[PDB]
Amino acid sequence: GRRPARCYRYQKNKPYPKSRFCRGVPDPKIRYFDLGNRRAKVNDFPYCFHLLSGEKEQVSSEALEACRIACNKYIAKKAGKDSFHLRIRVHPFHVIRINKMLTGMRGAWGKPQGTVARVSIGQPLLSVRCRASAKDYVKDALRRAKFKIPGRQAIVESRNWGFTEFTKEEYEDLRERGELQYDGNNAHRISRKGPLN
Amino acid sequence: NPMRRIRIEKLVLNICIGGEGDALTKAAKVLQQLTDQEPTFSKSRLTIRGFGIRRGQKISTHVTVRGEKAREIIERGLRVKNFELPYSCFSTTGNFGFGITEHIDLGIKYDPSMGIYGMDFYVVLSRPGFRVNKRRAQQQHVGASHKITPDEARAWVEREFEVVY
Amino acid sequence: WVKVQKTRSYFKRFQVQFRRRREGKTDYQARKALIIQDKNKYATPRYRFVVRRTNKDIICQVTAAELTKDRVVCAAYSHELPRYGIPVGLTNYAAAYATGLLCGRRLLEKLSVGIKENALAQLYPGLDKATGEEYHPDENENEEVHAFKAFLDIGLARASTGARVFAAMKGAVDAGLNIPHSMKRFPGYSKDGFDSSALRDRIMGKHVGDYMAELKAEDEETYRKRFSKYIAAKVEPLRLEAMYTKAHAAIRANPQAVKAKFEIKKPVRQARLTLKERKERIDAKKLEA
Amino acid sequence: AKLKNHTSKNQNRKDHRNGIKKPKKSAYTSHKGMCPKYLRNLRRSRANDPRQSLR
Amino acid sequence: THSQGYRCKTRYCFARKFRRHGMANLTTYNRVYKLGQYVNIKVNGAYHKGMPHRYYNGRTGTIFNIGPRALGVQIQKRVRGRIMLKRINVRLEHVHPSDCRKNHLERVAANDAARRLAKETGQPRQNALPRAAHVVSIASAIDITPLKYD
RNA sequence: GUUCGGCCAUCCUACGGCGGAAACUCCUUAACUCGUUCCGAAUUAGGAAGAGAAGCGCCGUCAGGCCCCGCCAGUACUGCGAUCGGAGACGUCGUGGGAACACGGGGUGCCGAACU
RNA sequence: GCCUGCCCCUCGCCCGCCCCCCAAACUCCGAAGGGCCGCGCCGCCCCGCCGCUGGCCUGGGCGGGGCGGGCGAAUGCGGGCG
RNA sequence: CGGAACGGCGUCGGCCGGUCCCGACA
RNA sequence: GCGGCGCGCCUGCUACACCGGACCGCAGGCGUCCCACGGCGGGCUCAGCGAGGACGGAGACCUCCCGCGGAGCAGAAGGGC
RNA sequence: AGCAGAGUGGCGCAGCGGAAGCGUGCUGGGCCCAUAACCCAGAGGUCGAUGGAUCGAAACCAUCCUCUGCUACCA
């Protein structure tokens, strides 16, 4: 509420997270950064889709909440809730401050009125892992999210299997070798250093 | 090995009387009477209203007896416990501890003005080779191969104090 | 279950203490104070006196600490005392005063090795009798050559009244090396009026002589076990005092160093594994399992 | 009513006009502040043979 | 800077590095210092007595006098228009002998060695200078090319 | 191998092995000298009945830590110019410097004085 | 399922292993760029002094000769002082 | 032809794909 | 004007790696308290994790182990040990 | 708003380390034929939340919560 957000957009002030010094911050709107099947398995959901920033803006936490709901609702209607795992990769730590409109610039240090998240170019603001059922639906679902975030953003299918660092070709190669492992939502390349038993 | 032998290093009898003043003094005499060794009082690290404690209040009295004098006291006390101890009682390091209620059962005269005094007997065990963790020079800790094990201690007490587990 | 206090982090932050301190043999704070010399003195050497007691041998060396190493000028040990008369009680209080006579006279003789006129040793004979006379070697007029100034090291040993280390320093001062000291941590100091006799008795072990009588009265069997070398060698309770005066005398006459033979019985030296040996070991536990 | 508080613009240029003037040679070899034992020795030591200026 | 105390903004400079925390090697005390040696000044947080100021940390000076306990060093501070020689008294724990002109001292011995060689026999600092000619074998030629953006 | 050092983890820590003639320790006792908030535990005195079990020394850990060198990467960042583009945020181009973590491979204290 | 229960299934804790993002007033590390100093008269060989120093035939300073060798970064410019 | 998030089957130039003599129920 | 007091001082920061750098910029202190909370020497190790001990537990005290300081050092904060 | 006070039995108020009291309310026992007064009693309060500190905090001090006490006009 208040501030059209054009005022807090391009990265300007030095990072101001809520430490001991900065207090009084009202709670951030976005709280659910993990959605869908957070409890999923590594082999499943081998298609990964990402929304990637083309600007250095500061996307508000209230703005981040809207993008989370828009993506979650569309994928859920089109395909099962358990056909995708959604991760909001930017977290709203930076604290934005307001000089109450009620004197003037004398004593203008602003009381905290908000929480915003700084997104550099090439940072995936949002990413999703989907099984083949939603391999199609997620792409336009993420476009319906793109509008809520300001600026220009690109939807790019990760060529890396799932959220795993390895490419889809590597994940299957490591799995067929047997070098691959499961850590619930992730896999490790070798795990070959430590004492042999 | 003769140098892998187990000996008792020390026995501490501790009486925490609990903010009674003269009673801890009478128990200072009690520890002195039963061990022929002057006692040392204790002070509170934490002060608590519920326990009747204030910082620096005298709550405990403890003498450390090392030698044949001590060994005799452990066995007088264990006769009170009927030579039986828990298998759990043994600490991981290799020491055990029991507690007696009533100084009289040890074989001390109960003049009844002096109060019945519950005591706690903790027995630390050592082995020839343990003057490496108390010496000012070369204070390196004892190796695990030489260190006492809870299992070793349980058997040593069985092969000596002959207590049930 | 239980957290591991020694994390890969605890290990990373750990600063090893200095090698000598991690072994425990050197008090760095004390020796830093001892090695301090006013910078105006510049490169003039400062000489330290080291007395460390081992299980059976009181060890004395006079050393100067250089920037790259430590340099001992001369050293005497209780192992040498059988050459000059005493074969038993090599660590007794009387051995200490006698080792420091060797320590002080070995040096006074070596400083006077080339002088040949009025030398270091020639100027200061030192106390011919063995007595607690508060002897100080620098109270004299001196001038030209003066007493070598060393500083006593008690090391990690407490400076107890009556300590063996303290006897050694009185032995060096009696030889004539000026080790600064106050006769307060030596036996027999009772406030004013030092009892010279008590030090004289201790440096001529009569205390052992009385203990020998206590065992010869209470139980002869314990006295064979607690005094085996003393019984085996002909060291009588009465004769030891005569032996000590000869031991002090032998040292003063010839205190020079004679070297016992050295056979270097070096050990097996099992070799470290090679990378292929290290890799085959990995293979065996890859084969078994 | 509010005058500029502080600026260092054109301070280094002003210094450089006749800047980097070294602090003389007397300071480099001056006996000011030296140990009263070094100098007292020096003055007595100097007063011998060619160096002595005594009448 | 409302606060300009003696030890101000010395959170990082004065502090020891990673594991150096502890006493100083006895070498610091054992080293012999000669009048007029070029010595660097490097403050050590532990020895609070006798510390050089934050300006004097990093500087290299000469020793004006050798006193018992404290070396006296003369370092030049450029105050505005003039450079002023300030003599300060530093504890031996925060000064470190500086190689400084070890290069010049090494070179003079080297030049003298060459002069000596010239007397003994010797019958017949350049900043870079040209590469000169040289001929290189081109048969191992790897033709490289720009790579497409993907 | 001891005592004293030097620089102060390639030296550390944890767990195995293997050792000692001498040495070091462990050890054995309190008549004294001294010594414990109490206790010869430490410590101080006096020793020599034992001992490699320990400490200690040498070897082992797809050991941690550590040091070395690769790769990361000409990457991130920034010095200097740009009538370079861009609505800006920023990013390019010429001319200069160049990380870091990760990750990969290797190692794992040596140096002097006195001694024997 | 059980005088009741100690006959146990599933989660919160604890602990490990991963993982998303971060910090003007966090720091394992750590650039760019800056700061400070040096870039000429070196050695050998004696000698004189000192109450200053010291086991000394000691250091160290300040001087006097001799015997050796010289000019030993690039570029531009005469500097300094009241 | 100040200007944006955005649209555009205006017109050129790319890119990643495919179907296509088997002719893009016959 | 009022409210403040960068109106004398200090710690961390803005300050853009020597030093310097502004604001009624930030997050904060000081005007005291100690003959001991002083000097010096000697001896000692702390906070704890785990484990054991009549009363005795969410804490009474005594023991062990392993403890790079996680304690403490009058008081702000940064150092330092 | 700034700036300054105030948070405690149910209620109204006290409370300086260390006591959380009064008055009433309330729950009993009587006194009266009963109900009041009356007499004999008991129980009443995370001392507004979050902290901090001395080593035990209504107190000491912040931060919030929650109320209240007074305030450029003038071009």
PDB file of all heavy atoms in Angstrom, chain I residues 1-4 75, chain J residues 2-3 54 71-72:
ATOM      1  P     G I   1      15.603  29.981  15.845  1.00  0.00           P
ATOM      2  OP1   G I   1      16.549  30.574  16.860  1.00  0.00           O
ATOM      3  OP2   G I   1      16.046  28.684  15.214  1.00  0.00           O
ATOM      4  O5'   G I   1      14.170  29.740  16.524  1.00  0.00           O
ATOM      5  C5'   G I   1      13.602  30.768  17.365  1.00  0.00           C
ATOM      6  C4'   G I   1      12.150  30.437  17.599  1.00  0.00           C
ATOM      7  O4'   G I   1      11.515  30.189  16.321  1.00  0.00           O
ATOM      8  C3'   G I   1      11.883  29.161  18.401  1.00  0.00           C
ATOM      9  O3'   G I   1      11.886  29.410  19.798  1.00  0.00           O
ATOM     10  C2'   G I   1      10.481  28.787  17.920  1.00  0.00           C
ATOM     11  O2'   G I   1       9.463  29.465  18.622  1.00  0.00           O
ATOM     12  C1'   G I   1      10.525  29.194  16.452  1.00  0.00           C
ATOM     13  N9    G I   1      10.831  28.102  15.538  1.00  0.00           N
ATOM     14  C8    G I   1      11.935  27.994  14.732  1.00  0.00           C
ATOM     15  N7    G I   1      11.940  26.907  14.003  1.00  0.00           N
ATOM     16  C5    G I   1      10.765  26.258  14.351  1.00  0.00           C
ATOM     17  C6    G I   1      10.240  25.030  13.890  1.00  0.00           C
ATOM     18  O6    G I   1      10.725  24.253  13.057  1.00  0.00           O
ATOM     19  N1    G I   1       9.027  24.732  14.508  1.00  0.00           N
ATOM     20  C2    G I   1       8.403  25.517  15.443  1.00  0.00           C
ATOM     21  N2    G I   1       7.245  25.060  15.934  1.00  0.00           N
ATOM     22  N3    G I   1       8.892  26.675  15.878  1.00  0.00           N
ATOM     23  C4    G I   1      10.073  26.980  15.294  1.00  0.00           C
ATOM     24  P     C I   2      12.527  28.347  20.793  1.00  0.00           P
ATOM     25  OP1   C I   2      12.266  28.801  22.177  1.00  0.00           O
ATOM     26  OP2   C I   2      13.920  28.088  20.355  1.00  0.00           O
ATOM     27  O5'   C I   2      11.668  27.036  20.522  1.00  0.00           O
ATOM     28  C5'   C I   2      10.364  26.867  21.107  1.00  0.00           C
ATOM     29  C4'   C I   2       9.724  25.605  20.588  1.00  0.00           C
ATOM     30  O4'   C I   2       9.679  25.635  19.137  1.00  0.00           O
ATOM     31  C3'   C I   2      10.483  24.326  20.877  1.00  0.00           C
ATOM     32  O3'   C I   2      10.285  23.865  22.204  1.00  0.00           O
ATOM     33  C2'   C I   2       9.884  23.387  19.842  1.00  0.00           C
ATOM     34  O2'   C I   2       8.600  22.919  20.193  1.00  0.00           O
ATOM     35  C1'   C I   2       9.757  24.310  18.632  1.00  0.00           C
ATOM     36  N1    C I   2      10.889  24.230  17.693  1.00  0.00           N
ATOM     37  C2    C I   2      10.959  23.152  16.806  1.00  0.00           C
ATOM     38  O2    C I   2      10.065  22.295  16.832  1.00  0.00           O
ATOM     39  N3    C I   2      11.994  23.074  15.940  1.00  0.00           N
ATOM     40  C4    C I   2      12.931  24.025  15.933  1.00  0.00           C
ATOM     41  N4    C I   2      13.932  23.910  15.059  1.00  0.00           N
ATOM     42  C5    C I   2      12.887  25.130  16.830  1.00  0.00           C
ATOM     43  C6    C I   2      11.857  25.196  17.681  1.00  0.00           C
ATOM     44  P     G I   3      11.507  23.252  23.083  1.00  0.00           P
ATOM     45  OP1   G I   3      10.994  22.920  24.462  1.00  0.00           O
ATOM     46  OP2   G I   3      12.701  24.192  23.055  1.00  0.00           O
ATOM     47  O5'   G I   3      11.878  21.862  22.354  1.00  0.00           O
ATOM     48  C5'   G I   3      11.018  20.724  22.590  1.00  0.00           C
ATOM     49  C4'   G I   3      11.192  19.721  21.480  1.00  0.00           C
ATOM     50  O4'   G I   3      11.034  20.377  20.198  1.00  0.00           O
ATOM     51  C3'   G I   3      12.573  19.077  21.361  1.00  0.00           C
ATOM     52  O3'   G I   3      12.819  18.083  22.343  1.00  0.00           O
ATOM     53  C2'   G I   3      12.483  18.545  19.933  1.00  0.00           C
ATOM     54  O2'   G I   3      11.654  17.418  19.788  1.00  0.00           O
ATOM     55  C1'   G I   3      11.860  19.752  19.241  1.00  0.00           C
ATOM     56  N9    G I   3      12.864  20.699  18.773  1.00  0.00           N
ATOM     57  C8    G I   3      13.113  21.968  19.232  1.00  0.00           C
ATOM     58  N7    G I   3      14.107  22.556  18.613  1.00  0.00           N
ATOM     59  C5    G I   3      14.541  21.611  17.695  1.00  0.00           C
ATOM     60  C6    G I   3      15.588  21.677  16.748  1.00  0.00           C
ATOM     61  O6    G I   3      16.361  22.617  16.521  1.00  0.00           O
ATOM     62  N1    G I   3      15.688  20.493  16.022  1.00  0.00           N
ATOM     63  C2    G I   3      14.893  19.388  16.184  1.00  0.00           C
ATOM     64  N2    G I   3      15.145  18.341  15.390  1.00  0.00           N
ATOM     65  N3    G I   3      13.906  19.321  17.070  1.00  0.00           N
ATOM     66  C4    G I   3      13.790  20.463  17.788  1.00  0.00           C
ATOM     67  P     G I   4      13.883  18.368  23.490  1.00  0.00           P
ATOM     68  OP1   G I   4      13.256  18.069  24.832  1.00  0.00           O
ATOM     69  OP2   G I   4      14.428  19.766  23.325  1.00  0.00           O
ATOM     70  O5'   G I   4      15.062  17.323  23.193  1.00  0.00           O
ATOM     71  C5'   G I   4      16.289  17.824  22.621  1.00  0.00           C
ATOM     72  C4'   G I   4      16.495  17.196  21.265  1.00  0.00           C
ATOM     73  O4'   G I   4      15.815  17.992  20.264  1.00  0.00           O
ATOM     74  C3'   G I   4      17.953  17.078  20.808  1.00  0.00           C
ATOM     75  O3'   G I   4      18.364  15.720  20.843  1.00  0.00           O
ATOM     76  C2'   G I   4      17.930  17.541  19.351  1.00  0.00           C
ATOM     77  O2'   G I   4      17.755  16.466  18.455  1.00  0.00           O
ATOM     78  C1'   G I   4      16.731  18.479  19.315  1.00  0.00           C
ATOM     79  N9    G I   4      17.007  19.880  19.614  1.00  0.00           N
ATOM     80  C8    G I   4      16.271  20.675  20.457  1.00  0.00           C
ATOM     81  N7    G I   4      16.711  21.904  20.532  1.00  0.00           N
ATOM     82  C5    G I   4      17.801  21.925  19.677  1.00  0.00           C
ATOM     83  C6    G I   4      18.670  22.991  19.351  1.00  0.00           C
ATOM     84  O6    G I   4      18.650  24.152  19.777  1.00  0.00           O
ATOM     85  N1    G I   4      19.649  22.588  18.446  1.00  0.00           N
ATOM     86  C2    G I   4      19.769  21.333  17.914  1.00  0.00           C
ATOM     87  N2    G I   4      20.780  21.136  17.059  1.00  0.00           N
ATOM     88  N3    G I   4      18.948  20.330  18.210  1.00  0.00           N
ATOM     89  C4    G I   4      17.995  20.690  19.100  1.00  0.00           C
ATOM     90  P     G I  75      32.300  -4.352  32.166  1.00  0.00           P
ATOM     91  OP1   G I  75      31.397  -5.514  31.821  1.00  0.00           O
ATOM     92  OP2   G I  75      33.702  -4.423  31.601  1.00  0.00           O
ATOM     93  O5'   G I  75      31.597  -2.990  31.688  1.00  0.00           O
ATOM     94  C5'   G I  75      30.163  -2.876  31.832  1.00  0.00           C
ATOM     95  C4'   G I  75      29.780  -1.420  31.896  1.00  0.00           C
ATOM     96  O4'   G I  75      30.654  -0.729  32.823  1.00  0.00           O
ATOM     97  C3'   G I  75      29.960  -0.615  30.609  1.00  0.00           C
ATOM     98  O3'   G I  75      28.945  -0.836  29.638  1.00  0.00           O
ATOM     99  C2'   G I  75      29.940   0.800  31.180  1.00  0.00           C
ATOM    100  O2'   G I  75      28.643   1.211  31.550  1.00  0.00           O
ATOM    101  C1'   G I  75      30.831   0.609  32.404  1.00  0.00           C
ATOM    102  N9    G I  75      32.242   0.844  32.120  1.00  0.00           N
ATOM    103  C8    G I  75      33.227  -0.094  31.947  1.00  0.00           C
ATOM    104  N7    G I  75      34.400   0.427  31.686  1.00  0.00           N
ATOM    105  C5    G I  75      34.169   1.794  31.681  1.00  0.00           C
ATOM    106  C6    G I  75      35.065   2.863  31.456  1.00  0.00           C
ATOM    107  O6    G I  75      36.278   2.805  31.216  1.00  0.00           O
ATOM    108  N1    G I  75      34.420   4.095  31.548  1.00  0.00           N
ATOM    109  C2    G I  75      33.088   4.276  31.820  1.00  0.00           C
ATOM    110  N2    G I  75      32.651   5.540  31.869  1.00  0.00           N
ATOM    111  N3    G I  75      32.239   3.273  32.032  1.00  0.00           N
ATOM    112  C4    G I  75      32.845   2.066  31.944  1.00  0.00           C
TER     113        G I  75
ATOM    114  P     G J   2       5.637  11.168  17.845  1.00  0.00           P
ATOM    115  OP1   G J   2       5.830   9.665  17.824  1.00  0.00           O
ATOM    116  OP2   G J   2       4.685  11.664  18.934  1.00  0.00           O
ATOM    117  O5'   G J   2       7.076  11.867  18.058  1.00  0.00           O
ATOM    118  C5'   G J   2       7.917  12.119  16.904  1.00  0.00           C
ATOM    119  C4'   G J   2       8.577  13.464  17.066  1.00  0.00           C
ATOM    120  O4'   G J   2       7.607  14.502  16.767  1.00  0.00           O
ATOM    121  C3'   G J   2       9.074  13.802  18.476  1.00  0.00           C
ATOM    122  O3'   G J   2      10.402  13.362  18.734  1.00  0.00           O
ATOM    123  C2'   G J   2       9.021  15.329  18.456  1.00  0.00           C
ATOM    124  O2'   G J   2      10.150  15.883  17.818  1.00  0.00           O
ATOM    125  C1'   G J   2       7.738  15.576  17.671  1.00  0.00           C
ATOM    126  N9    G J   2       6.538  15.641  18.498  1.00  0.00           N
ATOM    127  C8    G J   2       5.516  14.729  18.534  1.00  0.00           C
ATOM    128  N7    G J   2       4.552  15.046  19.360  1.00  0.00           N
ATOM    129  C5    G J   2       4.968  16.251  19.905  1.00  0.00           C
ATOM    130  C6    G J   2       4.331  17.074  20.861  1.00  0.00           C
ATOM    131  O6    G J   2       3.250  16.879  21.435  1.00  0.00           O
ATOM    132  N1    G J   2       5.093  18.208  21.138  1.00  0.00           N
ATOM    133  C2    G J   2       6.305  18.511  20.568  1.00  0.00           C
ATOM    134  N2    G J   2       6.889  19.653  20.959  1.00  0.00           N
ATOM    135  N3    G J   2       6.908  17.740  19.665  1.00  0.00           N
ATOM    136  C4    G J   2       6.187  16.630  19.384  1.00  0.00           C
ATOM    137  P     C J   3      10.691  12.267  19.876  1.00  0.00           P
ATOM    138  OP1   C J   3      12.026  11.669  19.618  1.00  0.00           O
ATOM    139  OP2   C J   3       9.502  11.388  19.989  1.00  0.00           O
ATOM    140  O5'   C J   3      10.782  13.134  21.209  1.00  0.00           O
ATOM    141  C5'   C J   3      11.481  14.389  21.243  1.00  0.00           C
ATOM    142  C4'   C J   3      10.791  15.331  22.197  1.00  0.00           C
ATOM    143  O4'   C J   3       9.513  15.753  21.645  1.00  0.00           O
ATOM    144  C3'   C J   3      10.404  14.736  23.536  1.00  0.00           C
ATOM    145  O3'   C J   3      11.518  14.547  24.412  1.00  0.00           O
ATOM    146  C2'   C J   3       9.343  15.720  24.003  1.00  0.00           C
ATOM    147  O2'   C J   3       9.870  16.940  24.476  1.00  0.00           O
ATOM    148  C1'   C J   3       8.586  15.970  22.698  1.00  0.00           C
ATOM    149  N1    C J   3       7.447  15.056  22.513  1.00  0.00           N
ATOM    150  C2    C J   3       6.256  15.319  23.195  1.00  0.00           C
ATOM    151  O2    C J   3       6.186  16.327  23.912  1.00  0.00           O
ATOM    152  N3    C J   3       5.209  14.478  23.042  1.00  0.00           N
ATOM    153  C4    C J   3       5.324  13.406  22.256  1.00  0.00           C
ATOM    154  N4    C J   3       4.263  12.605  22.133  1.00  0.00           N
ATOM    155  C5    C J   3       6.528  13.109  21.559  1.00  0.00           C
ATOM    156  C6    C J   3       7.553  13.954  21.711  1.00  0.00           C
ATOM    157  P     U J  54      26.356  -5.638  34.129  1.00  0.00           P
ATOM    158  OP1   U J  54      27.141  -4.400  34.341  1.00  0.00           O
ATOM    159  OP2   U J  54      26.800  -6.610  33.091  1.00  0.00           O
ATOM    160  O5'   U J  54      26.293  -6.345  35.553  1.00  0.00           O
ATOM    161  C5'   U J  54      25.630  -5.695  36.650  1.00  0.00           C
ATOM    162  C4'   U J  54      25.623  -6.603  37.847  1.00  0.00           C
ATOM    163  O4'   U J  54      24.465  -6.327  38.683  1.00  0.00           O
ATOM    164  C3'   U J  54      25.448  -8.083  37.570  1.00  0.00           C
ATOM    165  O3'   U J  54      26.559  -8.765  37.001  1.00  0.00           O
ATOM    166  C2'   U J  54      25.121  -8.578  38.967  1.00  0.00           C
ATOM    167  O2'   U J  54      26.265  -8.536  39.784  1.00  0.00           O
ATOM    168  C1'   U J  54      24.166  -7.484  39.448  1.00  0.00           C
ATOM    169  N1    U J  54      22.758  -7.844  39.239  1.00  0.00           N
ATOM    170  C2    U J  54      22.186  -8.720  40.141  1.00  0.00           C
ATOM    171  O2    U J  54      22.788  -9.173  41.098  1.00  0.00           O
ATOM    172  N3    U J  54      20.878  -9.040  39.883  1.00  0.00           N
ATOM    173  C4    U J  54      20.100  -8.587  38.841  1.00  0.00           C
ATOM    174  O4    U J  54      18.932  -8.957  38.757  1.00  0.00           O
ATOM    175  C5    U J  54      20.762  -7.686  37.952  1.00  0.00           C
ATOM    176  C6    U J  54      22.039  -7.357  38.172  1.00  0.00           C
ATOM    177  P     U J  71      -1.361  23.927  24.576  1.00  0.00           P
ATOM    178  OP1   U J  71      -1.345  25.332  25.050  1.00  0.00           O
ATOM    179  OP2   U J  71      -2.649  23.203  24.453  1.00  0.00           O
ATOM    180  O5'   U J  71      -0.621  23.868  23.165  1.00  0.00           O
ATOM    181  C5'   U J  71       0.183  24.966  22.676  1.00  0.00           C
ATOM    182  C4'   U J  71       1.468  24.436  22.080  1.00  0.00           C
ATOM    183  O4'   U J  71       1.707  23.114  22.630  1.00  0.00           O
ATOM    184  C3'   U J  71       1.473  24.261  20.566  1.00  0.00           C
ATOM    185  O3'   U J  71       1.991  25.401  19.894  1.00  0.00           O
ATOM    186  C2'   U J  71       2.420  23.082  20.358  1.00  0.00           C
ATOM    187  O2'   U J  71       3.775  23.467  20.269  1.00  0.00           O
ATOM    188  C1'   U J  71       2.197  22.254  21.623  1.00  0.00           C
ATOM    189  N1    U J  71       1.265  21.127  21.469  1.00  0.00           N
ATOM    190  C2    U J  71       1.715  19.891  21.876  1.00  0.00           C
ATOM    191  O2    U J  71       2.818  19.718  22.360  1.00  0.00           O
ATOM    192  N3    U J  71       0.817  18.866  21.709  1.00  0.00           N
ATOM    193  C4    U J  71      -0.456  18.947  21.189  1.00  0.00           C
ATOM    194  O4    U J  71      -1.140  17.928  21.097  1.00  0.00           O
ATOM    195  C5    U J  71      -0.847  20.261  20.783  1.00  0.00           C
ATOM    196  C6    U J  71       0.005  21.279  20.931  1.00  0.00           C
ATOM    197  P     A J  72       1.516  25.801  18.383  1.00  0.00           P
ATOM    198  OP1   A J  72       0.216  26.513  18.471  1.00  0.00           O
ATOM    199  OP2   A J  72       1.654  24.619  17.483  1.00  0.00           O
ATOM    200  O5'   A J  72       2.638  26.838  17.929  1.00  0.00           O
ATOM    201  C5'   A J  72       3.736  26.425  17.092  1.00  0.00           C
ATOM    202  C4'   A J  72       4.344  27.619  16.393  1.00  0.00           C
ATOM    203  O4'   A J  72       5.472  27.178  15.595  1.00  0.00           O
ATOM    204  C3'   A J  72       3.415  28.360  15.438  1.00  0.00           C
ATOM    205  O3'   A J  72       2.912  29.507  16.105  1.00  0.00           O
ATOM    206  C2'   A J  72       4.357  28.875  14.357  1.00  0.00           C
ATOM    207  O2'   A J  72       4.936  30.120  14.678  1.00  0.00           O
ATOM    208  C1'   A J  72       5.453  27.812  14.334  1.00  0.00           C
ATOM    209  N9    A J  72       5.287  26.784  13.309  1.00  0.00           N
ATOM    210  C8    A J  72       5.200  25.428  13.500  1.00  0.00           C
ATOM    211  N7    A J  72       5.076  24.743  12.390  1.00  0.00           N
ATOM    212  C5    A J  72       5.088  25.714  11.398  1.00  0.00           C
ATOM    213  C6    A J  72       4.989  25.635  10.000  1.00  0.00           C
ATOM    214  N6    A J  72       4.850  24.489   9.329  1.00  0.00           N
ATOM    215  N1    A J  72       5.038  26.790   9.302  1.00  0.00           N
ATOM    216  C2    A J  72       5.161  27.940   9.975  1.00  0.00           C
ATOM    217  N3    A J  72       5.279  28.141  11.285  1.00  0.00           N
ATOM    218  C4    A J  72       5.223  26.975  11.950  1.00  0.00           C
TER     219        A J  72
END
